[PDB]
Amino acid sequence: SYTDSYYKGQTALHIAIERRNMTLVTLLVENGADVQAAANGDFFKKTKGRPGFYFGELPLSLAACTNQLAIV
Amino acid sequence: SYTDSYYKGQTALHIAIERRNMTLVTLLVENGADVQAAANGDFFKKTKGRPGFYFGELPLSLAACTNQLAIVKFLLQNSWQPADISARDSVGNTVLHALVEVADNTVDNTKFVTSMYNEILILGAKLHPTLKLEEITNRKGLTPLALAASSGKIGVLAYILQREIHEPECRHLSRKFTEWAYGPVHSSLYDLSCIDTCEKNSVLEVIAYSSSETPNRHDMLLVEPLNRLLQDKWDRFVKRIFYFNFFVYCLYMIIFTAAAYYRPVEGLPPYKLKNTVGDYFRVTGEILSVSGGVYFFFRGIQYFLQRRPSLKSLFVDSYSEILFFVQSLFMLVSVVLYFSQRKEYVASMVFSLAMGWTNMLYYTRGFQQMGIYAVMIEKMILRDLCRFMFVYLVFLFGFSTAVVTLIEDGKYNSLYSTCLELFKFTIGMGDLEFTENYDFKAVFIILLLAYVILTYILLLNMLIALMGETVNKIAQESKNIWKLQRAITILDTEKSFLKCMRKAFRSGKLLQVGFTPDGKDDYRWCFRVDEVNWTT
Amino acid sequence: VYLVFLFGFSTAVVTLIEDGKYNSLYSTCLELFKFTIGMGDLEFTENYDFKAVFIILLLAYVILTYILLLNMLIALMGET
Ligand SMILES: C=C(C)[C@]12C[C@@H](C)[C@@]34O[C@](Cc5ccccc5)(O[C@@H]1[C@@H]3C=C(COC(=O)Cc1ccc(O)c(OC)c1)C[C@]1(O)C(=O)C(C)=C[C@@H]41)O2
Numbered sequence: 001s002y003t004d005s006y007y008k009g010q011t012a013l014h015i016a017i018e019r020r021n022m023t024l025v026t027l028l029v030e031n032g033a034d035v036q037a038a039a040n041g042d043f044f045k046k047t048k049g050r051p052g053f054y055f056g057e058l059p060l061s062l063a064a065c066t067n068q069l070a071i072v
Numbered sequence: 073s074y075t076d077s078y079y080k081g082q083t084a085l086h087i088a089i090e091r092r093n094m095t096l097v098t099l100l101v102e103n104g105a106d107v108q109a110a111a112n113g114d115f116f117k118k119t120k121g122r123p124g125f126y127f128g129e130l131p132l133s134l135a136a137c138t139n140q141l142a143i144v145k146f147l148l149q150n151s152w153q154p155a156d157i158s159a160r161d162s163v164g165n166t167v168l169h170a171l172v173e174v175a176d177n178t179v180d181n182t183k184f185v186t187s188m189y190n191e192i193l194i195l196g197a198k199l200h201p202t203l204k205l206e207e208i209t210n211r212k213g214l215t216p217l218a219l220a221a222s223s224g225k226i227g228v229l230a231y232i233l234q235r236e237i238h239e240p241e242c243r244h245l246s247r248k249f250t251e252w253a254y255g256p257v258h259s260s261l262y263d264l265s266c267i268d269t270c271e272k273n274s275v276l277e278v279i280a281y282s283s284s285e286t287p288n289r290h291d292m293l294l295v296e297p298l299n300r301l302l303q304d305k306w307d308r309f310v311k312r313i314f315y316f317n318f319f320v321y322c323l324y325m326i327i328f329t330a331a332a333y334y335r336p337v338e339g340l341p342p343y344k345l346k347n348t349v350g351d352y353f354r355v356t357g358e359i360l361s362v363s364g365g366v367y368f369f370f371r372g373i374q375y376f377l378q379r380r381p382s383l384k385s386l387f388v389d390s391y392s393e394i395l396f397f398v399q400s401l402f403m404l405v406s407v408v409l410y411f412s413q414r415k416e417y418v419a420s421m422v423f424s425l426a427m428g429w430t431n432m433l434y435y436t437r438g439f440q441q442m443g444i445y446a447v448m449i450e451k452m453i454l455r456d457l458c459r460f461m462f463v464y465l466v467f468l469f470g471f472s473t474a475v476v477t478l479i480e481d482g483k484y485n486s487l488y489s490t491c492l493e494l495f496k497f498t499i500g501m502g503d504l505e506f507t508e509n510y511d512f513k514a515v516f517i518i519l520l521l522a523y524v525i526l527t528y529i530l531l532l533n534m535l536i537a538l539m540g541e542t543v544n545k546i547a548q549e550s551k552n553i554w555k556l557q558r559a560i561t562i563l564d565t566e567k568s569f570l571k572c573m574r575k576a577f578r579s580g581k582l583l584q585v586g587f588t589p590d591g592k593d594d595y596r597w598c599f600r601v602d603e604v605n606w607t608t
Numbered sequence: 609v610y611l612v613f614l615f616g617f618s619t620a621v622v623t624l625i626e627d628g629k630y631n632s633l634y635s636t637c638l639e640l641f642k643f644t645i646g647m648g649d650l651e652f653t654e655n656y657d658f659k660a661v662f663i664i665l666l667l668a669y670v671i672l673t674y675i676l677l678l679n680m681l682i683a684l685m686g687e688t
């Protein structure tokens with residue numbers, strides 16, 4: 001996962017869910033990918049004076065937030 | 073070609089291109105027709121008080137302007153007589169300047185002009201990869217971008233600043249570079265070149281020092297890269313320097329007030345010092361006050377030389393510099409009378425002192441909430457009182473002369489005291505005490521009551537209603553007004569800067585593309601912006 | 609805004625006058641405040657020096673504060 005101060009904890013599954021790739025999500029979960037990682041960098045936390053995207057830091061919350069019921 | 077003063081230089085090719093007749097254009101160009109003729113009659117030049125059609129005087133510009141892409145391609149790409157994409161007219165305008173000028177900020181026109189602009193750029197890149205059309209300046213020194221900003225072309229400006237061409241081999245024509253995107257967020261780099269550091273005439277200078285007649289003067293600062301730039305410059309350096317200047321002005325005015333209050337009351341200036349503490353503090357304050365006056369005098373002169381404002385718009389813009397300059401003039405006249413041994417220097421000094429306090433309202437602008445009061449006061453003085461002054465003076469001089477003629481030997485047999493009394497009646501603090509027993513008392517009473525009804529009741533409330541609508545008109549325009557004033561402050565702070573510092577740039581001199589048409593790389597002073605958009 | 613105007617003209621007037629009822633910041637600030645709300649005097653029966661400058665200053669104050677600023681406040685309050 002990303003180790004920097006901004007994208008900390010982001011992994012492949014978050015990108016796959018964001019990109020709306022059902023197949024890659026299935027492949028990652030099949031290969032033992034963690035479905036309960038926390039993506040908890042400054043880009044992903046609640047904030048007012050900064051651009052960002054808060055979603056709850058978890059792939060399940062991300063899939064729900066982006067309106068992808070099938071992945072949920 | 074036409075030989076008269078109106079259609080001078082027009083030829084068949086111009087008519088054919090206007091007629092959208094591809095066949096005639098093909099025939100004429102085939103027969104050796106000059107594709108770089110100049111049509112430079114009065115019908116074809118830039119003009120304000122005359123109907124006309126300016127297009128840049130050349131067939132290529134005409135073909136682009138009328139939305140005939142095919143003829144542009146044919147003129148540039150046919151071998152019989154190729155057209156010079158870089159040609160300039162008498163004004164110095166290239167085709168891109170011509171396209172900028174014939175914008176009008178409507179949806180359909182913006183689509184037409186923007187599209188033709190972009191296609192001309194692609195054709196230029198393919199035909200002449202070593203040519204940079206957008207840097208070519210017309211006779212006023214303006215590039216197409218500077219010209220678009222100058223004329224208030226919001227659509228063309230918003231297009232150019234946010235230009236992104238998703239095509240290989242011509243990405244160097246882009247200015248916006250989307251580095252990445254997430255759900256609602258995306259990050260791009262903006263080119264920034266000749267926005268802030270241009271060395272001829274940058275975008276922000278042109279928007280700020282526009283003449284207040286440009287239609288979209290405030291809207292042009294809402295376009296994304298500019299707004300973020302101004303916010304960054306404000307938060308980094310300009311904010312602290314602004315507060316420091318305001319504090320120093322406050323100290324200056326306190327010193328001036330204290331120096332003025334404790335003036336000596338004996339006769340015949342200049343006044344010699346005594347070896348005492350009070351005189352040393354007083355003369356110290358006097359020296360500092362006069363120094364400040366000299367400083368404002370020279371700043372005003374530098375302003376009027378650098379800007380060269382015309383008489384018509386002298387007050388419409390530059391109101392603040394005028395008032396600061398007039399304050400300094402009162403100070404200098406006071407010094408001249410002081411050493412010239414006249415007590416009447418006091419009469420000058422107090423005026424400067426009064427003005428010195430009210431010019432504090434200059435510093436309220438640049439605040440979102442408080443700048444509205446300074447803006448309103450400026451506009452009400454310049455438009456409502458100044459128009460109303462003539463109407464009120466007609467009434468005042470009429471009834472004053474009537475009353476003074478009627479009266480023989482009273483307090484009303486003098487134009488000065490009579491004008492004072494009627495003025496007081498206008499603002500509701502007269503008397504109407506008819507205790508005197510002069511002749512023509514009935515006529516005197518009828519005249520005064522007619523005056524009081526006409527001026528206190530009718531005219532004054534008319535003025536107040538008009539001022540009320542002016543106040544309501546610009547209550548809702550507050551945000552725009554604030555933004556523009558903050559921009560002007562930032563530019564002036566960069567101009568003076570008083571510390572040998574020229575850290576006017578925002579982000580680094582980073583490689584943008586690295587792939588020119590040739591084997592070099594471009595470093596362009598890009599600026600990173602991450603935006604949020606909740607669409608879908 | 610109002611205090612900027614008031615302190616400006618109050619200090620100017622007090623500096624101009626030597627030994628009157630206007631040679632005091634307290635009474636002068638009171639008088640100019642009364643002028644703002646339309647219950648002053650404008651009685652120039654006194655015969656001190658610089659009478660013309662005193663008159664011009666007070667009339668400029670009365671136009672700027674009683675006519676211009678006060679009705680600006682009233683228009684804004686009316687919209688609220
Ligand atoms: C040169 C001009 C235009 C001007 C200079 C003087 C004489 C002025 O009166 C006027 C004429 C006048 C006189 C009396 C009532 C209304 C207008 O308007 C201004 C000018 C107008 C004002 C009005 O008060 C202000 O709010 C000043 C001001 C407004 C907005 C600003 O952005 C500002 O920043 C510099 C200053 C202040 C005076 O300069 C002042 O302090 C005195 C003693 C008279 C006012 O002449």
Ligand SMILES: CCCCCCCCCCCCCCCC(=O)O[C@H](COC(=O)CCCCCC)COP(=O)(O)OCCN
Pocket residue numbers: 513514517518521522525
């Ligand atoms: C709001 C919009 C509508 C406004 C309507 C206006 C109404 C104003 C009220 C009337 C005011 C009358 C003024 C007082 C009359 C007066 O006191 O004076 C009269 C002299 O004649 C006049 O002035 C004629 C009256 C003026 C004509 C009319 C404008 C008689 O003389 P004496 O003083 O010696 O009285 C004898 C000794 N005590």
Ligand SMILES: CCCCCCCCCCCCCCCC(=O)O[C@H](COC(=O)CCCCCC)COP(=O)(O)OCCN
Pocket residue numbers: 457461464488489491492495652659660663664667671
């Ligand atoms: C509604 C918006 C438009 C507003 C327009 C404003 C018009 C107001 C006109 C009022 C003018 C009042 C003139 C004062 C005359 C006066 O009373 O003072 C004179 C000296 O004149 C001056 O003050 C200088 C001129 C002042 C000019 C000031 C603009 C000396 O007379 P005495 O003392 O010897 O009187 C001897 C017997 N008592």
